[PDB]
Amino acid sequence: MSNVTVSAFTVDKSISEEHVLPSSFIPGSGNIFPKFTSAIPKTAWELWYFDGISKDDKSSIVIGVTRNAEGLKHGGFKVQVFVIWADERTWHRDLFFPESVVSINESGVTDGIWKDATSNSSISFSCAGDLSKASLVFDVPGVVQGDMHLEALPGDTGLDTDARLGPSVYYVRPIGRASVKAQLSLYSSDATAAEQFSLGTSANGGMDRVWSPLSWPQVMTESYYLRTQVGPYAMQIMRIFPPAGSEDQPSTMARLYREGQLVCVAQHVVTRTHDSLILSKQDNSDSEDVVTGGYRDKNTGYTVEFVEEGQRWKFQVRHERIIWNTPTSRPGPDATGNTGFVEVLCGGTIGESYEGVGTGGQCELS
Numbered sequence: 001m002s003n004v005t006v007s008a009f010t011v012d013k014s015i016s017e018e019h020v021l022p023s024s025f026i027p028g029s030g031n032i033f034p035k036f037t038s039a040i041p042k043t044a045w046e047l048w049y050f051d052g053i054s055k056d057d058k059s060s061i062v063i064g065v066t067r068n069a070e071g072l073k074h075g076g077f078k079v080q081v082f083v084i085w086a087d088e089r090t091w092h093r094d095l096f097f098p099e100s101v102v103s104i105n106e107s108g109v110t111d112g113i114w115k116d117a118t119s120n121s122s123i124s125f126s127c128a129g130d131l132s133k134a135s136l137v138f139d140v141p142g143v144v145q146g147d148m149h150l151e152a153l154p155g156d157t158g159l160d161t162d163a164r165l166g167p168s169v170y171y172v173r174p175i176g177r178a179s180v181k182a183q184l185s186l187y188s189s190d191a192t193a194a195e196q197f198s199l200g201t202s203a204n205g206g207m208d209r210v211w212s213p214l215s216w217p218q219v220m221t222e223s224y225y226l227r228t229q230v231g232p233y234a235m236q237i238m239r240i241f242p243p244a245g246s247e248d249q250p251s252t253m254a255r256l257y258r259e260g261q262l263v264c265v266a267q268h269v270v271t272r273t274h275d276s277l278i279l280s281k282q283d284n285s286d287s288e289d290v291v292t293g294g295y296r297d298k299n300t301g302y303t304v305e306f307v308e309e310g311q312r313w314k315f316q317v318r319h320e321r322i323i324w325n326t327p328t329s330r331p332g333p334d335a336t337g338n339t340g341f342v343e344v345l346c347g348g349t350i351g352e353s354y355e356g357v358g359t360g361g362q363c364e365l366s
């Protein structure tokens, strides 16, 4: 091909002779192209993440497209698909492909394709060169078939901000705020039947972009993720507590937008100089429509305070529905695990009561 830059990872085939060079964080960029190209630390990983959640019916789709070093040796490159219907039924596969190819083409479009030529099966994504739009095609016969579309909402892109998440992780938000659609056919375990999934109306989400040379165990013991449009407000929170045996503070990459204007850029999480975030969890059973992780963390929700005589933004986060529960420990009375949530939100400034839904995920390593 001509004027097309490519990084091809094939299972059981060396990357040592890839022409393209590795990079770190590129300020002001989406950073969509892979960082580990011709050499990959044995613990390193890369993530292209997309989601959408409908406010009208709370259907939700969560996509995780990964590379890691281990994958090049053994087992391939994992793609995680999680869906929840309005009625709270859930569908989710971990799918592994032997080949992972990312492309920047002559137009400046970036394409990724995780594929298996043997099964004639693939999941791909495409990002416009101006990050106005991204889309995904699912084509795994008798598992998942369909697509997903994201349109960036007017306003600040937030790409001119720091993407460090503590000292060893990068977390860019290539599409911070987005309207999202999705039409999927999701097959049973035996591949004999299928159900239609249509993401509900008034759905927001986005695209995140994350890598580290270290495995997350060496990075975090706990993590919480939130993404939400709440009236004129949009926010993204990624908060981690540093690994066991560390004097480091909790790191955050938190952003608050108002009518598309970026109004708060927290890279510091505090309690009670720099834009900062308070993120404190609750256990009260105020209302009936509440739920919790199926592991040791029994929190029902969070309070989210953004602090700029600066203006003040507070939001209650109620866990209403479970998208997923996946373990990170043997079962027990003190088991840890990962939980995906349909989040319900309410707040803003003093006096304000805007309502939204959001995706959230909390992870604890044992």
Ligand SMILES: C/C=C/[C@@H]1C=C[C@@H]2C[C@H](C)CC[C@H]2[C@]1(C)C(=O)C1=C(O)[C@@H](CO)N(C)C1=O
Pocket (backbone or CB within 6 Å): 047, 049, 062, 063, 064, 065, 066, 080, 169, 210, 216, 219, 220, 223, 225, 240, 338, 361, 362, 363
């Ligand atoms: C499969 C790996 C994913 C990612 C890997 C390691 C990261 C460590 C980093 C320091 C914090 C967050 C972790 C990531 C960003 C993550 O948040 C999760 C997801 O991707 C979705 C599903 O895709 N999910 C299940 C998680 O909530």
